């Protein structure tokens, strides 16, 4: 994707933070290409969305990658088990 | 930690007091500002000696830590004085309130 | 199972107010008995 | 001119005026610990049976201590090695703190 | 679908947020086409309504995409697991 | 169903909030309709109901469309899993 | 029904909620006449109280309809996951 | 029953209830009749006092018909999840 | 039985409770007589304790009957399920 | 949340105390009513001065935000002032208290 | 909830004070009994100026509500007034303390 | 047994319970003597202890014949499932 | 609950000053024992004006409930002022504190 | 056993509690002999150390019976299920 | 056993009413002087 | 065992216990000697240890021997269901 | 509970003023000690008149009970006051501070 | 890797901590080419990701690597079960 | 082992305790020559780390042999079931 | 390994754990050597790494060894069941 | 317990007044750092009678025990007033607190 749609979605308006989420979209699309058959060397289009909905899932998790709960002065969150888990079922599906 | 808030770290230096002219003029150091995650807004009734006034007692957390000295900050167009810092391994929590 | 009880206390302390207390009173009795031989 | 009366007074009275608002405010401590285990416990295999036993007591002179006497309840405000934690005394603790401070200045101011 | 429906919905009547709702509905979009029929070129409409009923989940999930639960000194939020769970069976039973 | 009907259980006496029943109630008969089989144009009288009492969890949902759980400050609630589930049982049982 | 036995149960003496309960009454009505057998255009009297202990229910439920829990200050609620859950098997079994 | 019998077991003294213990009693005996074989036409004898039972149970019960458990004030009821469940082993195996 | 000896048994010296002892131990009388073989027109004698046994927890459950649990500034009281569940499998081994 | 209920804000504007006329006559502004969710009503005991009043402690939530200034509500035909006003993303809870 | 008890309402309507007669005497309206539930009865030692009393500090509850204005509340035969009252949607909970 | 070896056990030295321990008794010779086989007319003396242990069983319990737990006032009980529970290994070992 | 320990109640009624005199001699009545539980002992540390005494606050309870007036018990050989008594339905539990 | 043995194990050195150890100690002893083989008239002397332990088990039991649990203010226990669990496979495993 | 507490202590800065007092004493005996000397 | 080497590792260095340790050895060799095969006269040496490590577990257990959990003003123990749990295991693999 | 600890128990037993001779020497009486067991030492700051001083508050458990009167124990080498008792069916508990 | 790239995702931009990421780097790099197939001497670029993945999830545990859970004063950790677990089924699905 | 390499590991520079260490380490060395094959007379050089593993378990369990849990004044420790269970895997993976 | 390469991760910077780690150190490749097969000499540079990671684990719970659980002082740490459980994986798939 | 830290103690040792020169200079004696544990820093703002400090409270951990006297500790260069110490079997665990 474009950093730009990632960044209006999780509604940013500056560039202080440019350089982590580049990081975190080229890790999602190598992931998501890792998921692929062999013979594909590109996401298709079709499945663009989900760099970018993976890419805010992460944006949240920062600081947070490994840990299942994690408590700062009274704010606390709680994490998925696994970013990708919904669209393995599209994936799987879409090539079997 | 969703870092979203920008802050603007401050020190205000505490001058000295100057007698020939009876004042004892501050200054004020300010930064760039810092992605931070911030609680939500409070407005809080406090009651001073002089009457009503609407207080924000809250807390802001950065990732890592910053290298230089800071008395107050400035976010969401309030500022804050910090009141404690806590120094975690990879990240830093301060308490802050609204002055006034 | 273990006896994992949790436990949150409320307390205070007078005795230093107390004494601040009897100070000022026998000050207030020095007044008084100066004030009778006057 | 009579002063030491009301000296006299504050020496003799003001030690019931401290029991009874720390009794007051531990009474309040477990009401609002008691409704708020409901407010978070709610995925869904309440009993209650925490409820029916956050009790206080007065274990000293001028010292009430609360105590939730079920035995899994920490597991509940820390969470475990399977169990996010669903904190319930604590967000008291940042209640009552405010009330007794500021009931205790009430009574000087 | 519209923004403006959404919007409605949600009972939002100013601005302040129509960049995020933009890119919440064409993601919502583009996952739901991804549900569908590799063949099916086009969302039925019979379907459409799905798009803003998602959209409506995300745009109160905003803050808490991969987080399971989300909480501060008074506020908190649990999120079911998966947003088109409801429809992924409904989708299922028109096309078999 | 018409908006009035609804209008009546909820309690409501004003219009201040015409605009969201408007489109939960549009959306409830979306779902219904999507979940009848193939051949069926219309929810059948028999069913008008269900567009009803969903329309009034949902309204009650208001809020919280994705989330299990809502804490506001001393205010909370737990949702049902799935608003129409009690009916899938009368829709399979009738058509089949 | 009438609404009066519905009302005299619930000891409802006031006016104040007929608005109400007539439309809880007629909700409860047709769907006990959706769970008979398709031939059956008529509920049987047999079962003519079905009606009033789930009209019950849901005056009850005013306010959580779609809600499993609901809490407040000084006051809390848990519901039952189905209204007609004790009914669907003597329906049944009076059928079969 | 009479309602006396029921009056006595709960120990009221008084007319202040008479209208709801009523209702109460009438749908019992409803809902028990229902339970038995299409061709009985009314409660043997024999199961007489279940209609007294019941008629206790949901005396308590009153104003939590729907409800797992009522908290108020301090005060907190949680409910049996059938009224009738002890019966149905007895019913069942009388008739069959 | 003689009210007498669940009298004894309960410690209950005075009278002021006569009315509701007399009606709990004819209902569990009846019950008992519900549970035998259809033949047996009276309870055998090796089976009179069950009456008063149950009478005593009945007694105990005054207030409680529809309930599970009942809490109160202090007090509580969780009962179990059933109250002739032990005596189920003894009358089943008697007669067979 | 159920919005159920409808409340009235309203803000009462300060004015400047006149001595010339021993007035500071304030004025009201007043705004059209919005959809709300309320706690039930207390009517507790309050021990004044003067003696006791049926006071009532209260919070009050509404979706979203509203963009204009605010100091009382007038809801259940009670009127409050606020005294904490909190902000989440998506809804504002305000803690109000009845006046007398 | 078990209604099972049952309470007698009462309001005790305060005279304006009569400096021709020195009396200010109160007349009671009180009202048909209701069935309520009610806590079991405390009997605390409470410690006023002149010594020891059997106070009892109570909870009371009632299905619906009522039309009509209360003060007081007799029950058990032990006179309350009342000291809260909280309003639910189906439900009046009434905080009584015995007096004397 | 005798009343007195009860009585030793739970350490009484005085009169003032004797005709509540006199009906506990009772009744445990009463039950144990319905659990054995049909053709026993006498509990055998092997098994006599089991008629004081139980009667100690349930002068603890005496107060809360039905219930689960029990609290009053900081006291808190919880209680057996079955009294005879341990002994049916052994009656039935011993008779087959 | 195990009703093992006896109780002996006592009502100690109070006589009227006799200023002839300068008695008011109190009358005890002292009723027969009654089985009842009651906590374990406790010999607290209580710090009067004119020093330490081993206090004990504690809680018995009685099945059922007693016909007749009382104010003090005595068991344990420790005599307990009554100073609360809660009225269950089936049960009485009363909270004594020791005299001296 | 002796009396004395146990009193040593339990380091108990006065005599005010020999009146119940010696009731705990024959209740031990008639149940490991209900336990054994029907033939077996004497407890084997392999197994005389079982009546110690148990009693032991019961001494500190004493006053809890039936109970599964007992607490109160800061002093609280919890109790095993059967004091001969341990040793049914003893036995079990010698005579088998 | 995790404890919360919440500790309050209580203060009177009497020192300033001590040397009030004092000074309002040794005031007066001047007077006392003034008039018998 | 000889008691020295108990009372080394438990860190004792005076006699005050040894009433109590030399009956809790007693019991760990007679109870292990019972679980060995009926052949079998004396643990052998190569079980030795296992004598002296249950002879601490009951040590520590003093006072707790029927007892799953144990509080006494703010000191907690929890226990271990079974002291020979572990030596089964190589008790049974040895002989068999 | 592991009774490892062993505590010696005393009784300071107080003598009657001497006005003669201006004394009033106590004594001690001593026993055997006792298998016990304890909580683990604190050594507290506890701020006296005078100043500083390491306080210790614990408490001590023994099996059954002892026949003998006691007021101090000697434990660790530190020496306490026993400041409550707690007389469970088969047990003991001891509160106690340390004397200075 | 590049340690850089990692640097970059974690937003650290100072030089304090290489030395403890170089071995992270050099940890995750091993592990990840000790779960490929036993002739694979390189991993595959298609995979170099998943080191900058678990490096930064190793970041972010340091402390805490053989701990499920760390609190202190409310700061708290909880732990996924392990760092690999997501990629080992991309690993295998990638060699068949 | 010698003591001295369970000395270093643990950081014990003193000799307070060489008295329990050293039957700590006669213990362990005895519980694994009985887990061998009952041909093996000596401990294989390979597993002699075990020995030191578990003594350094057993010194930390110095008071709670027997106990699942130990806790006072907010010191607590919950331990594993089992010293050995990690390498009764290996000295039967070593022997088979 | 060297000591140094695990020092450098542990972030340590002075001399004052040699004594310790050297023993952890040495532990740890003693137990990989066991995991590996019988005729396997020396631990494959291939698996090196895992001697590091476990040292590490390790050194965090020095002082925990045996526990699953360890609160000191509002300080509070639980540990993962196994240290080499998630290598015990690659070694099987590599050898087998 | 994760034994990272490197903490210094001291025992500063209180010397007696000299009223010949007006002096009581203490001296420090001061130890070989030692492996701990510790908190995350807090900065509080503590609020003493000349004005706001940075404060800070806070516990160190250390395995087995030190056979020396303490009395400060010097760590994360910040110097602290042992305030309470807590001696468990394998363990020693010390309440400390920042001076200024």
């Not at chain 2, 807004?41 to 009457?51: C, N, P, T, V, Y």
């Not at chain 4, 002179?61 to 105590?67: A, G, K, P, W």
């Given at each position: 994707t474009t950093?730009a749609?990632?960044?209006?979605?999780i509604?940013?308006?500056d560039?202080?933070?440019?350089?982590?989420?580049?990081?975190?979209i080229?890790?999602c699309?190598?992931?998501?290409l890792?998921?692929?058959?062999?013979?594909?060397?590109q996401?298709?289009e079709?499945?663009?969305?989900?760099?970018?909905?993976?890419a805010v899932?992460?944006?949240?998790?920062?600081?947070?990658?490994?840990?299942?709960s994690?408590a700062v002065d009274g704010?606390?969150?709680?994490?998925?088990?696994?970013?990708?888990?919904?669209?393995?079922?599209?994936?799987?599906?879409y090539?079997? | 930690?969703?870092?979203?808030?920008?802050?603007?770290?401050?020190?205000?230096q505490?001058?000295?007091?100057?007698?020939?002219?009876?004042?004892?003029?501050?200054?004020?150091?300010?930064?760039?500002?810092?992605?931070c995650?911030?609680?939500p807004?409070?407005?809080?009734?406090?009651?001073?000696?002089?009457?009503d006034?609407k207080?924000?007692?809250?807390?802001?957390?950065?990732?890592?830590?910053?290298?230089?000295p800071?008395?107050?900050?400035?976010?969401?167009?309030?500022?804050?004085?910090?009141?404690?810092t806590?120094?975690?391994?990879?990240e830093?929590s301060?308490?802050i309130?609204?002055?006034? | 199972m273990?006896?994992?009880?949790?436990?949150?206390?409320?307390?205070?302390?007078?005795?230093?107010?107390?004494?601040?207390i009897?100070?000022?009173?026998?000050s207030?009795?020095?007044?008084?008995?100066?004030?009778?031989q006057? | 001119?009579?002063?030491?009366n009301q000296?006299?007074?504050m020496?003799?009275?003001?030690?019931?005026?401290?029991?009874?608002?720390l009794?007051?405010?531990a009474?309040?401590y477990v009401?609002?610990?008691?409704?708020?285990?409901?407010?978070?416990?709610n995925?869904?295999?309440?009993?209650?049976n925490l409820?029916?036993n956050?009790?206080?007591?007065?274990?000293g002179?001028?010292?009430?201590?609360?105590?939730s006497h079920?035995?899994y309840?920490?597991?509940?405000?820390?969470?475990?090695?399977?169990?996010?934690?669903e904190?319930?005394?604590?967000?008291v603790?940042?209640?009552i703190?405010k009330?007794?401070?500021?009931?205790?200045?009430?009574?000087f101011?």
């Open positions: 950093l749609d990632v960044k209006k979605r509604g940013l308006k560039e202080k933070q440019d350089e982590q989420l580049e990081e975190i080229k890790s699309e190598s992931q998501l890792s998921m692929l058959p062999i013979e594909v060397e996401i298709p079709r499945f663009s969305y989900m760099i970018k909905e993976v899932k992460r944006y949240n998790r920062i600081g947070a990658e490994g840990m299942t994690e704010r606390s969150n709680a994490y998925e088990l696994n970013d990708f888990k919904e669209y393995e079922a599209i994936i799987d599906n090539f079997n | 930690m969703r870092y979203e808030d920008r802050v603007i770290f401050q020190l205000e505490v001058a000295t007091y100057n007698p020939k002219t009876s004042k004892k003029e501050n200054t004020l150091i300010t930064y760039d500002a810092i992605p995650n911030i609680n807004i409070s407005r809080a009734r406090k009651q001073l000696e002089f009457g006034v207080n924000d007692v809250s807390v802001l957390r950065i990732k890592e830590s910053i290298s230089y800071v008395s107050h900050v400035l976010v969401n167009g309030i500022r804050y004085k910090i009141v404690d806590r120094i975690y391994r990879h830093t301060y308490y309130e609204e002055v006034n | 273990t006896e994992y009880k949790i436990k949150a206390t409320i307390e205070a302390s007078v005795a230093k107010f107390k004494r601040q009897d100070s000022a009173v026998k207030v009795q020095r007044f008084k008995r100066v004030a009778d006057t | 001119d009579a002063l030491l000296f006299h007074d020496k003799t009275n003001i030690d019931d005026d401290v029991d009874d608002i009794q007051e405010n009474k309040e009401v609002r610990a008691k409704l708020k285990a409901r407010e978070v416990m995925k869904g295999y309440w009993t209650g409820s029916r956050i009790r206080y007591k007065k274990t002179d001028l010292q009430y201590t609360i105590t079920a035995a309840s920490g597991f509940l405000e820390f969470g475990t090695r399977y169990m996010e934690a904190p319930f005394m604590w967000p603790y940042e209640v703190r009330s007794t401070v500021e009931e205790l200045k009430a009574l101011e």
